[PDB]
Design an enzyme around this catalytic site. Sequence first.
Site, short mmCIF file in Angstrom:
data_model
loop_
_atom_site.label_atom_id
_atom_site.label_comp_id
_atom_site.label_asym_id
_atom_site.label_seq_id
_atom_site.Cartn_x
_atom_site.Cartn_y
_atom_site.Cartn_z
N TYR A 85 3.38 5.05 5.95
CA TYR A 85 2.68 5.31 4.67
C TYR A 85 1.50 6.27 4.79
O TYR A 85 0.50 5.97 5.46
CB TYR A 85 2.16 4.01 4.05
N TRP A 99 10.34 -6.41 -2.05
CA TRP A 99 9.55 -5.25 -2.48
C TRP A 99 10.08 -4.48 -3.72
O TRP A 99 11.28 -4.59 -4.11
CB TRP A 99 9.35 -4.25 -1.32
N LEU A 150 9.06 -3.81 -9.68
CA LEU A 150 9.23 -3.03 -10.89
C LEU A 150 10.06 -1.78 -10.61
O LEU A 150 9.91 -0.76 -11.27
CB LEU A 150 7.87 -2.62 -11.44
N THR A 166 0.79 -1.23 0.00
CA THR A 166 0.00 0.00 0.00
C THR A 166 0.83 1.30 0.00
O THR A 166 0.33 2.41 0.23
CB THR A 166 -0.96 -0.02 1.18
N1 LIG Z 1 10.09 -2.80 3.67
C1 LIG Z 1 10.37 -1.61 3.06
O1 LIG Z 1 11.22 -0.77 3.42
C2 LIG Z 1 9.56 -1.32 1.82
C3 LIG Z 1 10.00 -0.25 0.97
C4 LIG Z 1 9.26 0.03 -0.21
C5 LIG Z 1 8.14 -0.70 -0.51
N2 LIG Z 1 7.73 -1.75 0.36
C6 LIG Z 1 6.51 -2.54 0.11
O2 LIG Z 1 6.62 -3.14 -1.11
C7 LIG Z 1 5.48 -2.85 -1.93
C8 LIG Z 1 6.04 -2.76 -3.32
O3 LIG Z 1 5.53 -1.62 -3.97
P1 LIG Z 1 6.28 -0.77 -5.03
O4 LIG Z 1 5.57 0.50 -5.25
O5 LIG Z 1 7.70 -0.68 -4.64
O6 LIG Z 1 6.26 -1.67 -6.31
P2 LIG Z 1 6.72 -1.66 -7.85
O7 LIG Z 1 6.24 -2.92 -8.47
O8 LIG Z 1 8.15 -1.33 -7.93
O9 LIG Z 1 5.98 -0.34 -8.39
C9 LIG Z 1 4.52 -0.20 -8.42
C10 LIG Z 1 4.20 1.17 -9.05
O10 LIG Z 1 4.61 1.08 -10.49
C11 LIG Z 1 3.46 1.28 -11.36
N3 LIG Z 1 3.05 0.00 -12.05
C12 LIG Z 1 2.61 -1.16 -11.45
N4 LIG Z 1 2.29 -2.13 -12.29
C13 LIG Z 1 2.53 -1.60 -13.49
C14 LIG Z 1 2.35 -2.15 -14.78
N5 LIG Z 1 1.91 -3.39 -14.98
N6 LIG Z 1 2.69 -1.35 -15.83
C15 LIG Z 1 3.15 -0.07 -15.65
N7 LIG Z 1 3.34 0.56 -14.45
C16 LIG Z 1 3.00 -0.27 -13.38
C17 LIG Z 1 2.30 1.76 -10.51
O11 LIG Z 1 1.76 3.07 -10.89
P3 LIG Z 1 2.44 4.53 -11.17
O12 LIG Z 1 3.92 4.34 -11.15
O13 LIG Z 1 1.85 4.83 -12.50
O14 LIG Z 1 1.91 5.45 -10.07
C18 LIG Z 1 2.71 1.47 -9.05
O15 LIG Z 1 2.46 2.59 -8.19
C19 LIG Z 1 4.87 -1.56 -1.32
O16 LIG Z 1 3.52 -1.33 -1.59
C20 LIG Z 1 5.20 -1.74 0.13
O17 LIG Z 1 4.14 -2.45 0.74
C21 LIG Z 1 8.44 -2.03 1.48
#
Ligand SMILES: NC(=O)c1ccc[n+]([C@@H]2O[C@H](COP(=O)([O-])OP(=O)(O)OC[C@H]3O[C@@H](n4cnc5c(N)ncnc54)[C@H](OP(=O)(O)O)[C@@H]3O)[C@@H](O)[C@H]2O)c1
Lengths: 100, 100, 326, 326, 326, 326
Positions: F55, F208, F211, F21
């Site tokens: 968050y 995490w 992408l 999230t």
């Molecule tokens: N433990 C930690 O320190 C830590 C740190 C970071 C994250 N996390 C967790 O890990 C999760 C991973 O999330 P993330 O945001 O890093 O993931 P990600 O897969 O790297 O990026 C997702 C973002 O990229 C875009 N996207 C997703 N699918 C797509 C597709 N099929 N085609 C084109 N663009 C696409 C989305 O929209 P836009 O880009 O268009 O807005 C989305 O906001 C988080 O939600 C969180 O719960 C944990």
Amino acid sequence: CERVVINISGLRFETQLKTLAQFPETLLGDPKKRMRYFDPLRNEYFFDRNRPSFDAILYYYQSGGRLRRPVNVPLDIFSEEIRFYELGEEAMEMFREDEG
Amino acid sequence: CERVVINISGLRFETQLKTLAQFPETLLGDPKKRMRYFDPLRNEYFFDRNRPSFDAILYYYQSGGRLRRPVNVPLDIFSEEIRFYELGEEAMEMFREDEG
Amino acid sequence: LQFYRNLGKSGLRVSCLGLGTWVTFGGQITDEMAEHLMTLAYDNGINLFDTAEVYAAGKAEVVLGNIIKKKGWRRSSLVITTKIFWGGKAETERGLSRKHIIEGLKASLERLQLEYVDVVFANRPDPNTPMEETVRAMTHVINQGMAMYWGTSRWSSMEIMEAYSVARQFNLIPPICEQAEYHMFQREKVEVQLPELFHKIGVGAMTWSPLACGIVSGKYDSGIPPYSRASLKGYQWLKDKILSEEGRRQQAKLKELQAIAERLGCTLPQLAIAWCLRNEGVSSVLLGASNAEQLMENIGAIQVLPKLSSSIVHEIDSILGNKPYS
Amino acid sequence: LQFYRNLGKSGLRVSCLGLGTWVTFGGQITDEMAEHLMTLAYDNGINLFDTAEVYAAGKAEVVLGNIIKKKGWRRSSLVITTKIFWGGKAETERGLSRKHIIEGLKASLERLQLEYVDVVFANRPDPNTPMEETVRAMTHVINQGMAMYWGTSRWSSMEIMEAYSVARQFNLIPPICEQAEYHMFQREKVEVQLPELFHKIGVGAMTWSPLACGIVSGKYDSGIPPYSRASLKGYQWLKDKILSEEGRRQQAKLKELQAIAERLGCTLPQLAIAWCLRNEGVSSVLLGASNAEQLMENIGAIQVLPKLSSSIVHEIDSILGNKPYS
Amino acid sequence: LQFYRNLGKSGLRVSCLGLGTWVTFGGQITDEMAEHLMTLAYDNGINLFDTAEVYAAGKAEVVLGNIIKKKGWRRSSLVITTKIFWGGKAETERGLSRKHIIEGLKASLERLQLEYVDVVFANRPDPNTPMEETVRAMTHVINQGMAMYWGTSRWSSMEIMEAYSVARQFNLIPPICEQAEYHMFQREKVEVQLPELFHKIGVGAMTWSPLACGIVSGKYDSGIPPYSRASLKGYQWLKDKILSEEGRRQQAKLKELQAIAERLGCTLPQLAIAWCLRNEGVSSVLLGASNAEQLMENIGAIQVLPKLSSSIVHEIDSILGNKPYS
Amino acid sequence: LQFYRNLGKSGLRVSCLGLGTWVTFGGQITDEMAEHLMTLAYDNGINLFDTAEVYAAGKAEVVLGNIIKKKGWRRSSLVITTKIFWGGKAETERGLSRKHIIEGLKASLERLQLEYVDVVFANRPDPNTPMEETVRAMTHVINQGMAMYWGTSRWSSMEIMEAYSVARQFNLIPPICEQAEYHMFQREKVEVQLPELFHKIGVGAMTWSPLACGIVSGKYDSGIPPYSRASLKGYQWLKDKILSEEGRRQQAKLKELQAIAERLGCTLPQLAIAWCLRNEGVSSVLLGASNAEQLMENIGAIQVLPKLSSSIVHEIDSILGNKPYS
Ligand SMILES: NC(=O)c1ccc[n+]([C@@H]2O[C@H](COP(=O)([O-])OP(=O)(O)OC[C@H]3O[C@@H](n4cnc5c(N)ncnc54)[C@H](OP(=O)(O)O)[C@@H]3O)[C@@H](O)[C@H]2O)c1
Ligand SMILES: NC(=O)c1ccc[n+]([C@@H]2O[C@H](COP(=O)([O-])OP(=O)(O)OC[C@H]3O[C@@H](n4cnc5c(N)ncnc54)[C@H](OP(=O)(O)O)[C@@H]3O)[C@@H](O)[C@H]2O)c1
Ligand SMILES: NC(=O)c1ccc[n+]([C@@H]2O[C@H](COP(=O)([O-])OP(=O)(O)OC[C@H]3O[C@@H](n4cnc5c(N)ncnc54)[C@H](OP(=O)(O)O)[C@@H]3O)[C@@H](O)[C@H]2O)c1
Ligand SMILES: NC(=O)c1ccc[n+]([C@@H]2O[C@H](COP(=O)([O-])OP(=O)(O)OC[C@H]3O[C@@H](n4cnc5c(N)ncnc54)[C@H](OP(=O)(O)O)[C@@H]3O)[C@@H](O)[C@H]2O)c1
């Protein structure tokens, strides 16, 4: 049968309470005499003494009376311990003669 | 009397704090010197050293000064330990002469 | 000399005298009398009150609880103790099983209208329950805050030592007290065995039946007085004891003791009770009383304590002829 | 001889006979019948009732709870047990994970309308959960007072020993009981393996399916009677077993046993059930019953227990020809 | 330099300055003034507030609690500490017994209208309570979530070490802080003994009475000012100290220090307070204040901290002539 | 192949894909979209949802909680995780101190409208808090039933090992999972270091940013698309990365990978995501999504998993040229 724990400078020894009761006059066999070295926190008797020697001191009771001086323990040292643990002049001499 | 725990490569030794205070200049008898080897998690002093030797190193304090080299410990090794634990040149020589 | 003293080596301070509720509360006496008895004891410094789920089938606990709730005394100023073992007719309502200790104390706490007791006791030993289970349960009810401490009653030294031992083995809480019988005609255990456990593992003694159920009061000299405990329905066992060959031998000895009593200018009861506290081995003596008079008389034992010279003691030992060999 | 006996070496006392709720409660029989069955069992001394979150998808637990709440019996007089493992269609609703054991027992406790159970069992082993996690969870629910004790079911000796072992390793609570299948045609585990765990670590056996699901009753001699369990929808597996080459071999043996039954003047069921208790290794046998008659008949097994001479036993061993080698 | 710093080696971050409530809250000053004092301290960054069940017989705790509940500050942003030892006139209402620590903290928590305190302190040592009992109780109240951490006050090094030692022995929680007296005329303990415990077992020092009760402010130069603490009823002990041969010797030394004060351009108080924090051995200094002015002045000590050169220190050591030998 | 798999060696079963999230819930997207995203993920088998007190300053937690409470899903079927570290502007509202972990998780649990979370993570390491304090706090919140398990995030191997080590030292609960960054341009830690901790102490990896925040989707080929994360206010850091010399080098590599993507007949995202799960070392990959389309596309990665031959992998390794040396 209720067991006892004897800690000799960190080296832990364990035996049954009857094993020590087999020689009621010695320090370890006499409740009143060993009472002074009991640790309530750990439930064990502690002695700040020679570690190598106690091996035999305990075997003495388990063996029914055998009092041999460990090959790696000096004669003057082991003798002091036999005295402290209050094994008794009899066993004391018997050791002496079995030793020279 | 407050007791201390000395861990020599896993082999645990225990003695009273006054027993070590009987030789204030040695490493174990000097608060400032042994402070470096204290483990707060286990409440014990740890030394990554020779196990066989420490038996005597501790007896030295309990005996009031007797420094004998365990029959199973080489001369060159046990000498190094006496040096590390900082027993003192006096006791050091006394050992030397009692040893050759 | 010291009115309050540590129960064993624990930090729990108790008056050398406490008021019990066996036979009286919710039973022999009335709630008004119970209230009166407790108020007296309280205002006179006693902070120790002992009861048990088995007393008057829970009723004693109800009465005691009511009095506490009525007088609105501060909980932090009372030391309430209750014993657990016989809590019901069902198979699982007796013993020292984890199930019974929990349910049992819970039931008691409810009756007393209290969130916890200061000390919970195993009323007697339980050969059918592993010591580990029992110590674990005691330790549980204390962590749940249903008790401050726990103790044993009618346990042998070995049994108490086993409990202590198991606690250290599993890092649980050891028992702090043993509630043992003690009076001039029952001295062995308190005088020989417990002092050792006191020095070795700090377990203190909280003794009961200082007047051997009223017997040491001498009132059974000419027989069974009406309205006395031995007369009460359900106490034939007591009557029988009193009227036995041994029972008589005692009474006879009382006459002589009575002499020493008048000599020191106090009643025989006060002598016996004070006799119980003569040695620091005893932390507190639990009193029994059906009258407000009996209670006030008994409380007087304290003044008698200074007069108990070593000679007076040796004299009593003589007339009794039952001094146990250490 | 002794109607109540310690479950294993724990302090928990249970009747040698208990009433289970598999297939019947909230399922095959009606709530009125369930109530009747429990009341009978209760008034006849049985204090042990076994259920499981998986039985009738929770319904058995609801019915049992209702009966308890209706008859207003004292909780301290009942020993309720429930098993945990299959509690839902979701991935995380099965197993012995800390998550499932907690949620699972909580769910069950809610259904039963009880604050806790006397014993919670792992319904079967879980290869996907570290033993430490499982023992830690069991130990947790007991400290939270959601259970008095815990036990295993369908676990191998090594598995039970591992659990015990881990508990000592981390100072947690060991299992006190193993709920194993036992009847004349399933004897290996209870007769050979468990006695060792009983002597070594005190784990007792609470056996199930004394009549091999009704089979040892002989009623399947001429076939599948209407309204019998093997006839029930969803029990083809049972029907199939009954009508198998092996199934028949048993029935055939029943005829002979039936002889010994009439000889001692009791029904075959009573013989089999009493046969299960013949050895003190078994703490309690869980009964199954769809009729009030079936239950009362089964309870009769107790009277049969004295007649089980060593000869009678050897005779049965012969006709069975399946005595396991120690 | 660093306004917030770890209390000992624990993860608890505290301002180097905290506001205490001894003598003032619920006593000398008014609730409106108390509120004002706390709000100032808060808005200026101070997150540490110290109190004690004994202060104003619980009243200080009430006032402090009210202010917190009124200003609606976020609990996660305050570090409240309270001390336990003297909580009542009854025998059992004092000490470090499990009974008193539990009841005592509970009472305090109620008064403060808080579910817990960040750190609970033993107000002084208790020779009548086994260390094990005390550490077990402290560890209990923390697991019950009534406190985050615990600490000692007025305990000798050996005593603190014993506590730490027992905790490791039984796997309980060691004390994280010692609340000790520290000001230019009381330096031995904080300067010699505590640094060792800090390095060895991580215990930090939270010092009290930076102005030796107002004495180091110099206001007692010509005598006992009206409305000063030494003038307050019930503080003859302070007055007496101030007007003693030793009391005067100090005041005399103040005059000289005052010089160094004007030289660095700050008041004598700011000098003394900043003097207390000069060494990283001290985690936080608890301030005392009856006026909003006194408080704001005192808070200024922080700016003075950079000016405290090694020379300035040696100079002060000279005029004081009481530097303890390590 | 296996949609659900054990998180590390714990008994906790999780889908290989989970929905996070960060950036979206309570922030970039709307509550209606959040609801839609979760429902999709749920109905498609995903049981893992990750959030964090930091968050959207708690908002993400509120939204996620609302959705759960609205869809009325069974709690036993969801695996909710939240991270703790940054929970406020005050000094004491950040870190891994016992105070913050307790208050922090409590706050989160309240926001989520849940009694507990399945796994609580230290969001990053805390140099200012003793490991013992941290492990003790984690172990506390689990015994209080506020969490089922705990885990680390962004911790070095040594740090995780230290935690595990301390837990065994004091008989507390070790961490079961490390939440680490993993995508084609960040492979070192997950591919080299974690597998060792997995085999040695059973700690699993929940990765995490599959992408790399949308970068591996290729949509940043010609620049910063409007309404993309790099375009969002407060993400200049991301934009900057994307438009850097290194940022470009990657995009360039994407073009080539895109080839392999069309070749296997799936989008580049599905390739990268499936690429993350190729090795059993990874228990689950947390997805990020602002559109229902993005989510459904991403979920498709699973079908791609079988096509990932050793050759396909070696090919990707080539174009990437960043395969870490074990
Ligand atoms: N433990 C930690 O320190 C830590 C740190 C970071 C994250 N996390 C967790 O890990 C999760 C991973 O999330 P993330 O945001 O890093 O993931 P990600 O897969 O790297 O990026 C997702 C973002 O990229 C875009 N996207 C997703 N699918 C797509 C597709 N099929 N085609 C084109 N663009 C696409 C989305 O929209 P836009 O880009 O268009 O807005 C989305 O906001 C988080 O939600 C969180 O719960 C944990
Ligand atoms: N842990 C255990 O297993 C255990 C066992 C027994 C008792 N206890 C405890 O110990 C307490 C001790 O009570 P107890 O009944 O055994 O005590 P006791 O001192 O032996 O006997 C008290 C009884 O004797 C009579 N009496 C009391 N004072 C008297 C006096 N001054 N003059 C004449 N008669 C007097 C009273 O009235 P009547 O005789 O006229 O009715 C009273 O009921 C109990 O209340 C209970 O709490 C514990
Ligand atoms: N731990 C585990 O994994 C596990 C597994 C299975 C069972 N269990 C427990 O063990 C208990 C044992 O139950 P069970 O069903 O296996 O027991 P059982 O004694 O093998 O079978 C009982 C069934 O046989 C029939 N029956 C009972 N008494 C009879 C009699 N006197 N004459 C003729 N038929 C009779 C009944 O009716 P119908 O056949 O006519 O319907 C009843 O449903 C369960 O309730 C459960 O609590 C535990
Ligand atoms: N752990 C323990 O056993 C223990 C024992 C004592 C105190 N403490 C704690 O430590 C805190 C320290 O308080 P304290 O009273 O000892 O502190 P202090 O700094 O020695 O004295 C403060 C008192 O001196 C006066 N004063 C303060 N600032 C002044 C200034 N700038 N100029 C002139 N006079 C000034 C005030 O008014 P008046 O003198 O005019 O009334 C005030 O009441 C307490 O509040 C308590 O929380 C703990």
